[PDB]
Amino acid sequence: VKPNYALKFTLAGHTKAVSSVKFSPNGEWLASSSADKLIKIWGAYDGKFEKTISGHKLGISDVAWSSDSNLLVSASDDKTLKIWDVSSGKCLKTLKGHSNYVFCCNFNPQSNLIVSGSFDESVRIWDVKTGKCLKTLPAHSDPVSAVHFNRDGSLIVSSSYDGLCRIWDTASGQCLKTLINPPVSFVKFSPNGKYILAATLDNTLKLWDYSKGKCLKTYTGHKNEKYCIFANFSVTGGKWIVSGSEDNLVYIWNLQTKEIVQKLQGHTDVVISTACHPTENIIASAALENDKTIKLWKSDC
Ligand SMILES: O=C(O)c1ccc2c(c1)ncn2C1CCCCC1
């Protein structure tokens, strides 16, 4: 009926705003990115600081893991993405081509491709092995806020401040659907690929049916009018939607009923990012400059 997330650890180390937190697919690590130009790696279970990964020339908006947990990609205001070997901390490739800040990034499940979105209004698809751009999609008419591959890698969903979410065939780059306009600040496919979760800067999350192009559920009660705040499908226990919020709380909703089931109190600034652990009922959350911490929470269900 309700989870009971409780605070387990508070982590500190970044020196400017955190932008993203992500658990590795193998469950071992949490990665964080920051405006301080750094990626930090932390133990997923006890929060133990592991390493700092450095090389970008300006702040980082997003980081994402390869499926085997060995690689990270980061998206930076320096107009590049970087592919990193996590074990060595070394930059393997610098992905050059965007003409403005890179805001979002993700590997496909196969992890042979990366997708990126930029302030330059394009979505790019990159070959991981060569580090070269394969396609540039003229995807949007305003900054691209999120990019995500579906469960088998065959489709990409993008979102933009232009108010649109677009679905693309990965192999051909063709736009198969546009969901119709408040700025869309985040989007991702549901685990089964049939639905799309989208955040808009009007304090609203929406669950869309891809095949019907129609909104099925809305989730409200939180505050989101300014920042790029991701939303997650929590699937290890009860089926929830999880999101940060501009009122310093983590919100958790019942996916089916849309009711709020928990609000996590503890942060002292906007909760800018949350992530859900792949096997345990564990949430990571990060707050802005008045707070400066990442918090790890645990629920029994
Ligand atoms: O695993 C998934 O991707 C997934 C996606 C939507 C799911 C689900 C699982 N279980 C129930 N739903 C509802 C949510 C509200 C309407 C759509 C059906």
Curated annotation (Swiss-Prot):
Keywords carried by this UniProt record: Acetylation, Chromatin regulator, Host-virus interaction, Isopeptide bond, Nucleus, Repeat, Transcription, Transcription regulation, Ubl conjugation, WD repeat
Crosslink (Glycyl lysine isopeptide (Lys-Gly) (interchain with G-Cter in SUMO2)) position: K16
N6-acetyllysine modified-residue sites: K82
PROSITE patterns per the UniProt record, alphabetical: WD_REPEATS_1, WD_REPEATS_2, WD_REPEATS_REGION
Phenotypic consequence of S61F: Strongly reduced affinity for histone H3
GO biological process, alphabetically ordered: gluconeogenesis; negative regulation of transcription by RNA polymerase II; positive regulation of DNA-templated transcription; positive regulation of gluconeogenesis; regulation of cell cycle; regulation of cell division; regulation of DNA-templated transcription; regulation of embryonic development
GO MF annotation list: histone binding; histone H3K4 methyltransferase activity; histone H3K4me1 reader activity; histone H3Q5ser reader activity
Keyword Ribonucleoprotein recorded: no
SMART domains according to UniProt: WD40
Site entry (Important for interaction with histone H3), positions: D77, F103, F230, E289
Outcome following mutation: D77N: Strongly reduced affinity for histone H3
Mutagenesis / variant outcome for changing L207K: Loss of interaction with RBBP5 and reduced ability to stimulate KMT2A methyltransferase activity in association with RBBP5 and ASH2L
Stored InterPro entries: G-protein_beta_WD-40_rep, WD40/YVTN_repeat-like_dom_sf, WD40_repeat_CS, WD40_repeat_dom_sf, WD40_rpt
Effect of L288A: Abolishes histone H3 binding
Assembly, per entry: Interacts with PAXBP1; the interaction is direct and links a WDR5-containing histone methyltransferase complex to PAX7 and PAX3. Interacts with HCFC1. Component of the ATAC complex, a complex with histone acetyltransferase activity on histones H3 and H4. Component of the SET1 complex, at least composed of the catalytic subunit (SETD1A or SETD1B), WDR5, WDR82, RBBP5, ASH2L/ASH2, CXXC1/CFP1, HCFC1 and DPY30. Core component of several methyltransferase-containing complexes including MLL1/MLL, MLL2/3 (also named ASCOM complex) and MLL4/WBP7. (Microbial infection) Interacts with herpes virus 8/HHV-8 protein LANA1; this interaction regulates the MLL1 histone methyltransferase activity on viral DNA.
Similarity remark: Belongs to the WD repeat WDR5/wds family.
Function: Contributes to histone modification. May position the N-terminus of histone H3 for efficient trimethylation at 'Lys-4'. As part of the MLL1/MLL complex it is involved in methylation and dimethylation at 'Lys-4' of histone H3. H3 'Lys-4' methylation represents a specific tag for epigenetic transcriptional activation. As part of the NSL complex it may be involved in acetylation of nucleosomal histone H4 on several lysine residues. May regulate osteoblasts differentiation.
Record protein name field: WD repeat-containing protein 5
Organism: Homo sapiens (Human)
